Curated annotation (Swiss-Prot):
Disulfide bonds join 7-143, 138-170, 150-229. The chain holds residues 14 to 281 of 1356 of the full protein. This is Spike protein S1. It comes from the Viruses. Attaches the virion to the cell membrane by interacting with host receptor, initiating the infection. Residues 1-268 form the BetaCoV S1-NTD domain. Glycans are attached at residues 6, 16, 45, 101, 119, 158, 175, 179, 238.
Length: 268
C-alpha cells in the first residue's frame, strides 16, 4: 500500500500484470540531457567541473508507469514499483498525446515523493493537468491504492490518491506550464542537507530549476501513480504511458557552456 487510508474497495485484485520494463535506451549526457542548469547561475563560454546529483552515464531506466482500466492490482502498490528515493532520481517521461475531436490533450503519470505517505509527514506530488504541471508538498492523507485518470478520454474510476475533506498543511503549492505538444519531459528530483530540489525540461535538454523546499527530514520513497482510462491501450488507440526513471548519485561532471550560456556538452 502507499498511504493507509481506505479511499476505495471498487475493483481491486492481486493480479501480477507487469513488472517495470528496463529501457533499451541508456543515459547519454554527451549533449547535456541528464544534467541541469545550476540554480539561477549563468555560465558563459566556459567548461566547469561541477559536483552534483547526476545519473550514471550508460545506466538504464525502469519504466514505472502503470495504466489501468477498471481494475487496480494490490501488487502495483509494492516493490518493485514503490521505490527507495535515496539521493534522488532522473526521469524521462513520455508526454502521452490524445485527441478527443481534432483537439489535443496531454496526459502522463503523477509522481509522489515522500516517506511514510501519511498525514503526519509531507508528500511532494507532481501532477500534470493538460499543459499545467501542479506541484504541491502537503500533509496528504494518501490512499492505500492511489491513482489518477484521463480527464481527456473517459475513466471508469474516479480520481483518488488522497482523502482530505478540508485542505491539509502545505509547505509548497505552485503551478508551472509545459509545452503540451512535446514528446518528452525530463525531471531531476533530489535531496541534499535536508532540502529537496526539483528541476524539469519539456525538451531533450538540461533541466531548469522548478523549486527548492526545506524539509529537514529525508524523503525515503517515491511512487509513480497508476493512471486509468477508457483509452491508451492496444485495442483502442495503440498509445501508451511511459515514465522512465534512473537513480541519481553525488557525482562530478564536466559541463560545457556556449556563449549563450546553453549546456552544449557534458562528461560524467
Ligand atoms: C489522517 O490520516 C489518518 C490515517 O489514515 C486518518 O485516520 C483514519 O480516519 C478514518 C476515517 O475517519 C478512520 O476510519 C473510521 O474508523 C471508525 C472507527 O473504527 C472502529 O469501529 C469500526 C466499526 O464502526 C470497526 O470496524 C473498526 O475495527 C474499529 O474498531 C469507523 O467507525 C468508521 O466507519 C465508517 O467507515 C467505514 C469504511 O468506509 C464504513 O464501513 C462504516 O460503515 C462507516 O461508514 C471508519 O472506518 C480510521 O479509523 C482512522 N485511522 C486512524 C489510525 O486513526 C485521519 O482521519 C486523517 N486526518 C485528517 C485531518 O484527514
Ligand atoms: C499495468 C498494466 O498491466 N496495465 C495494462 C492493463 C492491465 O493488465 C489490465 O487492466 C488488468 O489489470 C488488473 C489490475 O487486473 O491492461 C490494458 O490492456 C487491457 C487488456 O489487458 C485492455 O485491452 C482492456 O481490456 C479489458 O478486457 C479489461 O478490462 O482489462 C477491457 C477494457 O475496456 C480494455 N481497456 C481499454 C479499452 O483501455 C488496459 O488498458 O487495461 C493495458 C495496460 O497497459
Ligand atoms: C494549479 O492548477 C490546478 C489545475 O488546473 C488548479 O486547480 C483548479 O482550480 C479551480 C479554481 O477555481 C477549480 O475550479 C478546479 O476544479 C481545479 N482543477 C483541478 C483539476 O483540480 C489550481 O487552482 C492552480 N493553482 C494553484 C495555486 O494550485
Ligand atoms: C474499505 O472501505 C469500504 C467502503 O466503506 C468497505 O466496504 C471495506 O470493507 C473496507 N475495506 C477494508 C480492508 O477496510
Ligand atoms: C510477477 O511476474 C514476474 C514475471 O513472471 C516475476 O518475475 C515476479 O517475481 C512476479 N511476482 C511479483 C510479486 O512481482
Ligand atoms: C569563447 O571562448 C574561446 C576560447 O577562449 C574564444 O576563442 C572565443 O573568442 C570566445 N568567444 C566569445 C564570444 O567570448
Ligand atoms: C464516481 O463518482 C460518482 C459521483 O460522485 C459516483 O456516482 C460513482 O459511484 C463514483 N464511482 C465510480 C466507480 O464511478
Ligand atoms: C512545442 O513542442 C513541439 C514538439 O516538440 C515543437 O515543435 C514546438 O516548437 C514547441 N513550442 C514551444 C512554444 O515550445
Ligand atoms: C494496434 O497495432 C497493431 C499492430 O500494428 C494492429 O494489429 C492493431 O490493429 C492496432 N489497433 C489499433 C486500434 O490501432
Amino acid at each position: 500500500v502507499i498511504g493507509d487510508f481506505n479511499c476505495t474497495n471498487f475493483a481491486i485484485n492481486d493480479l501480477n500484470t507487469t513488472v517495470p520494463r528496463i529501457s533499451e535506451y541508456v543515459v547519454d549526457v554527451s549533449y547535456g540531457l541528464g544534467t541541469y542548469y545550476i540554480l539561477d547561475r549563468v555560465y558563459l563560454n566556459t567548461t566547469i567541473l561541477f559536483t552534483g546529483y547526476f545519473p550514471k552515464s550508460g545506466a538504464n531506466f525502469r519504466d514505472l508507469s502503470l495504466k489501468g482500466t477498471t481494475y487496480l492490482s494490490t501488487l502495483w502498490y509494492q516493490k518493485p514499483f514503490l521505490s527507495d528515493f535515496n539521493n534522488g532520481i532522473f526521469s524521462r517521461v513520455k508526454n502521452t498525446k490524445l485527441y478527443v475531436n481534432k483537439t489535443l490533450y496531454s496526459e502522463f503519470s503523477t509522481i509522489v515523493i515522500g516517506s511514510v505517505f501519511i498525514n503526519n509527514s509531507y508528500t511532494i506530488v507532481v501532477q500534470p493537468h493538460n499543459g499545467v504541471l501542479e506541484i504541491t508538498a502537503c500533509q496528504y492523507t494518501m490512499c492505500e491504492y492511489p491513482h489518477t485518470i484521463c480527464k481527456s478520454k473517459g475513466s471508469s474510476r474516479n480520481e483518488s490518491w488522497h482523502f482530505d475533506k478540508s485542505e491539509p498543511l502545505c509547505l509548497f503549492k505552485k503551478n508551472f506550464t509545459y509545452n503540451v505538444s512535446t514528446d518528452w519531459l525530463y525531471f531531476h528530483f533530489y535531496q541534499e542537507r535536508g532540502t529537496f530540489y526539483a528541476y524539469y525540461a519539456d525538451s531533450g535538454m538540461p533541466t531548469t530549476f522548478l523549486f527548492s523546499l526545506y524539509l529537514g527530514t529525508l524523503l525515503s520513497h517515491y511512487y509513480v501513480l497508476p493512471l486509468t482510462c477508457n483509452a491508451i491501450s492496444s485495442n483502442t488507440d495503440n498509445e501508451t504511458l511511459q515514465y522512465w526513471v534512473t537513480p541519481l548519485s553525488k557525482r562530478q561532471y564536466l559541463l560545457k557552456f556556449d556563449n549563450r550560456g546553453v549546456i552544449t556538452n557534458a562528461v560524467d
